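Q: Hi! Curious about what Protein cyaY looks like structurally. Here's the sequence.
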Amino acid sequence: MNDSEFHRLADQLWLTIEERLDDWDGDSDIDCEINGGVLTITFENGSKIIINRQEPLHQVWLATKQGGYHFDLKGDEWICDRSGETFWDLLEQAATQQAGETVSFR
Ligand SMILES: [Co+2]
Ligand SMILES: [Co+2]
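A: Let's find out. The predicted structure is below.
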């Protein structure tokens, strides 16, 4: 039911972020690290973005310099449970702001 689908979609999200950041060619130095399954993106200004799994809830959480965002699996997207906004849009907006460079993955 929910557990296996969570593992499937989260594993895919992890890969998509990892691949996109390894393939980062822009001017800014952006680093991505995985520690205890948690992804940490680090920017040149020392700021970070942290992405982790909340297994009980089947949610992916985002922590940015600006706030914390909790995402529900909904179809082919991750949806911010307060605002309805998508995971990629919010991750791009924060990454763009923290890198001071467009960080656009679509
Ligand atoms: Co469960
Ligand atoms: Co490294």
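A: A fun detail: The two ends are 30 Å apart (CA to CA).
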